[PDB]
């Protein structure tokens with residue numbers, strides 16, 4: 001499913017993402033936008049290390065979910081990577097929260113650093129009623 005901007009903003013707010021570990025909703029929106037264009041079915045294969053980024057937040061199989069095909073990988077979110085391609089994003093949100101409950105926080109995603117860090121993200125939640 002490809003979410004509409006405000007549809008997603010309210011979806012993430014209902015899931016407890018607004019201010020989660022200090023990260024405003026707008027930052028999560030900016031992340032989803034740049035990672036997948038708000039597409040829950042987005043996947044990206046990394047030929048170099050044989051891992052795959054899954055879903056709306058493009059969570060990587062080397063550390064976060066299990067896909068059975070990434071050598072020496074772990075599964076910190078304790079989920080099948082399949083859970084990260086669901087139209088319903090509750091599992092992906094639980095995993096994204098897990099990701100930020102680590103040393104870097106929202107910085108774990110390079111995309112956030114490139115297109116969201118120190119830029120205006122309020123535009124992503126404008127008019128969404130959040």
Ligand code: NA
Nearest residue numbers: 061065073074
């Ligand atoms: Na894995």
